[PDB]
Design a protein around this nucleic acid. Structure first.
Lengths: 106, 110, 214, 203
RNA sequence: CAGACCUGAGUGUGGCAGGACCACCCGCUAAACUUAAGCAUAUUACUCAGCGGAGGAAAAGAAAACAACCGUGAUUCUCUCAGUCAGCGGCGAGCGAAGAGGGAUUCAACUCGUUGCCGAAUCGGGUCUUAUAUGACCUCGAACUGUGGCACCAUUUUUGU
RNA sequence: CCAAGAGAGUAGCACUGUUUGGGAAUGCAGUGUCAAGCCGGCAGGUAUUUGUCUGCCAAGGUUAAAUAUAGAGUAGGAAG
RNA sequence: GCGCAAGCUCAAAUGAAAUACCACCACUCGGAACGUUGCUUCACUUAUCGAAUGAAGAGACCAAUGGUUGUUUUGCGCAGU
């Protein structure tokens, strides 16, 4: 993402103690086009979403959703963590269902 | 087309159409399609164009089809398919089983 | 609650008061605050002093040693004096605890007994929010009770609803609403979870129903 | 590229919709013989992206392999031994099912070269992989200078040497140096290396 | 109103395969003896045996590396580190590496699938020309998509549209 | 006048086993489970959350040469 | 203090621990609504599964019918686009 790449780092000026080996002359890196990496390349979203829509949801997704619908929302602590695996993922699902509902609701 | 080798290949399409808010028809058979192109069967189809002369009928149709497909789609998105036992079993609930007579055979008379 | 997104008229309390019936009887308006959802055996509750501009609260008791200066002088100018012995007698029965919290808004206590007043009456005074403040032998009594007189008390407990009085109808619609606004401004500025556990707030007249603030 | 749809769609495994698709397939195989030629994949998206590109020489197979794990076969399940590799369902099975699968395809005929293969389905019983196999004899194919590499001597099989990426998975290939390590010169070779002997020219 | 298409047969038609060999390889799989003065963990050994299966070698190979630089730049291999301050481990027995450096060898690097690719598929098989392509034509493999182009290093990002 | 077209029951996670010098996990295999707003994904050898910061961009696809030959290799030398 | 009244208050008072203006943290049942979703009936017959056979009469035959099997031009109702 481009929030990580721009006029970086005029490293300074001498070894050790917060500055280190040489006052950089920080060359023009990184024109690194692999920051193309998804983004919202519109295509991605577009497709994903259509189909996303097309398929409805998962059992679980719904399941957690219920929890929200009540508000058992420390729950899914587990579901998201265990079911999805890892803490990020957890987060990821969390948005994912939630959003869909919330806006879905209007 | 609703008859195609992975239907999965095309499954996203009505939906897509709907997404692109375009006219989309649920059309029968690959074969005839094949035939207008002279291939053994044929896969997906659309008109960009024609000549205007032909349009009016097309227009009439398009509306209906979409009406039968897009406008209602959502409803169709409610409406499930499937479920179906044998005949025999229909006949059964109609018969020996659940409708011999008054019921299965319960009260007709009063 | 209390507000509206473009900030035009802004809006709940103003509709509730404007619609509110007028009457010749002297209607208090009291605030009903309802708490919901908390971290119980993790939390220390709220025993807090909410200060409300214009509440009809001013009355008060002076704890001194019994001698002429100024305990005798405070009796002749008709101030309640509660000596060290009398303060111990006041504390016990359930008849008296209610009339002390209900009939006093300010407490004053003498310089020569300063350790002893926390040791004795402090638990009652805690929930009240108007703890005994120091009174010297040269003190001016009416000039010392300032914000204690504006205090109304919040005592959370496991209370999911306590009622407080935010003023009377003799206090303007701006004063009763400014007191519920001030109250929330104190609650927000005093409670760790701010307004997260604030389910509902209402104002209600003596012969009016409660009206919710949105 | 429609596959873009296709793919995502294809990710939706865990759903009813799929499970229809799956289910038909699950009767179909369940009805069906063990290994079959296909006139096209049932999962083109992987196929084309694992490289299928529409002409002869490209051959499709669907293949059925029992899933589960396995027992260490022993007559009468008895090991003498010291404890260690014990248990009927002991040693777990290093090689992968896909790989076996491919390999079994590799064994299955006296030709085919697995170009690759992907899982299509699994049930309580069988895994199905749809296997992209190639013959390297079609004159067009042979003619084909893009793929003709396939023709060559190293290709007197492949799959059992462990040449699919997956095979290569069990074969362990990762370039992450300190998670690349040992297998990088095979399992063995490196062993040979690492436990070398005192070849010191001089001393 | 009427006969397909689709698939699965059976031919015919042209290939292929087997088994060898198997020093080395490439996979796969996979002992115990031993030692620990016992011995089960451990070790042996990720070895033996077994099995599959290649080549002239194979294998490997072009970043989801290394790093923590004043930086590095496919793989391989060698020397090296280091039998180590990495370390595993009845933590014992016994085990135990990588990175860099020096260095050999190398001018080594490469495609597709998600980008308009598109005036009767640009294809391929066959046929037939041309002495091959090409030409040409069918076949009919092929629009469920082969071509070409383009391939997150670019294209100039972007804006000089 | 803008685009900007990079691999899934795979990755991952649990679990089991097996496996590793690789240590609160070096892999693999099974089984279950099972990912991408793309402020992403992967890696950064003490578990974690939590946040930065640092390096890459996997999961399709091909690739001399330098190496081997290790016992049973075959054509043609050189030897001790 | 309250109100139309006025009762209890308050401001009595005791005990083990106290209330009108009355805001409420203390059990228990109780429900539909609250649509969902969890375990459960027992419904069923299509996955599976047992058997059986060179797969040799399933169902549609019973009373004056069915087919709520329909499918369905066609109709009405509704409702909607």
């Amino acid at each position: 993402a481009a929030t990580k790449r721009e006029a970086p780092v005029p490293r300074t000026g001498i070894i050790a103690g917060f500055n280190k080996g040489y006052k950089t002359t920080r060359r023009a890196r990184r024109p690194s086009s692999n920051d193309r990496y998804a983004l919202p390349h519109k295509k991605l979203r577009a497709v994903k979403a259509i189909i996303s829509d097309l398929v409805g949801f998962s059992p679980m997704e719904r399941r957690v959703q219920e929890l929200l619908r009540v508000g058992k929302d420390k729950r899914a602590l587990k579901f998201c963590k265990k079911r999805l695996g890892s803490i990020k993922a957890a987060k990821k699902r969390r948005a994912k269902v939630e959003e869909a509902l919330r806006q879905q609701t209007k | 087309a609703n008859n195609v080798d992975p239907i999965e290949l095309v499954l996203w399409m009505p939906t897509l159409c709907r997404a692109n808010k375009i006219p989309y028809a649920i059309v029968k058979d690959k074969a005839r399609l094949g035939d207008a192109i002279g291939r053994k069967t044929a896969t997906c189809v659309a008109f960009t164009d024609v000549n205007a002369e032909d349009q009016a009928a097309l227009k009439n149709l398009t509306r209906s089809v979409n009406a039968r497909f897009l406008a209602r789609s959502d409803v169709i998105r409610r409406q499930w398919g499937g479920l179906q036992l044998s005949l025999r079993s229909r006949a059964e609930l109609r018969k020996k089983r659940a409708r011999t007579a008054g019921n299965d055979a319960a009260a007709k008379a009063a | 609650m209390s507000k509206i997104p473009p900030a035009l008229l802004s809006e709940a309390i103003q509709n509730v008061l404007k619609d509110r019936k007028e009457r010749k009887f002297k209607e208090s308006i009291d605030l009903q605050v309802n708490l919901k959802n908390y971290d119980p055996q993790k939390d220390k509750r709220f025993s807090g002093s909410v200060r409300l501009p214009h509440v009809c609260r001013p009355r008060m008791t002076v704890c001194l040693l019994c001698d002429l200066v100024h305990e005798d002088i405070a009796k002749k100018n008709d101030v309640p004096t509660m000596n060290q012995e009398e303060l111990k007698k006041l504390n016990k029965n359930k008849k008296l605890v209610k009339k002390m919290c209900n009939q006093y808004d300010a407490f004053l206590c003498s310089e020569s007994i300063i350790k002893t007043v926390p040791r004795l009456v402090g638990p009652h005074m805690h929930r009240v929010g108007k703890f005994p403040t120091v009174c010297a032998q040269n003190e001016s009594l009416p000039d010392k009770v300032l914000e204690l007189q504006s205090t109304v008390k919040f005592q959370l407990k496991k209370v999911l609803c306590l009622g407080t009085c935010v003023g009377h109808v003799d206090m303007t619609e701006d004063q009763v609403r400014q007191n519920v606004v001030m109250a929330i401004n104190f609650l927000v500025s005093l409670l760790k979870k701010n307004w997260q556990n604030l389910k509902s707030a209402y104002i209600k007249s003596t012969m009016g129903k409660s009206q919710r603030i949105y | 590229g429609s596959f873009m749809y296709l793919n995502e769609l294809w990710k939706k495994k865990s759903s009813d919709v799929m499970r229809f698709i799956q289910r038909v397939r699950a009767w179909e195989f369940r009805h069906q013989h063990t290994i079959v030629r296909l006139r096209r994949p049932t999962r083109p998206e992987k196929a084309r992206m694992v490289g299928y590109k529409t002409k002869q020489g490209y051959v499709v197979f669907r293949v059925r392999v029992r899933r589960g794990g396995r027992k260490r076969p022993v007559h009468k399940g008895i090991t003498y031994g010291k404890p260690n590799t014990a248990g009927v369902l002991g040693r777990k099975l290093n090689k992968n099912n896909r790989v076996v699968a491919e390999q079994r395809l590799g064994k299955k005929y006296g030709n085919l070269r697995v170009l690759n293969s992907y899982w299509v389905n699994a049930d309580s019983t069988f895994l199905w992989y749809e296997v992209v196999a190639v013959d390297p004899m079609h004159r067009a194919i042979r003619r084909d200078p893009r793929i003709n590499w396939i023709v060559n001597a190293v290709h007197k099989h492949r799959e059992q040497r462990g040449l699919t990426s997956a095979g290569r998975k069990h074969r362990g290939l990762r370039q992450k140096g300190h998670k690349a390590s040992k297998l990088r010169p095979s399992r063995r070779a490196a062993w040979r290396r690492n436990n070398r002997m005192v070849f010191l020219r001089k001393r």
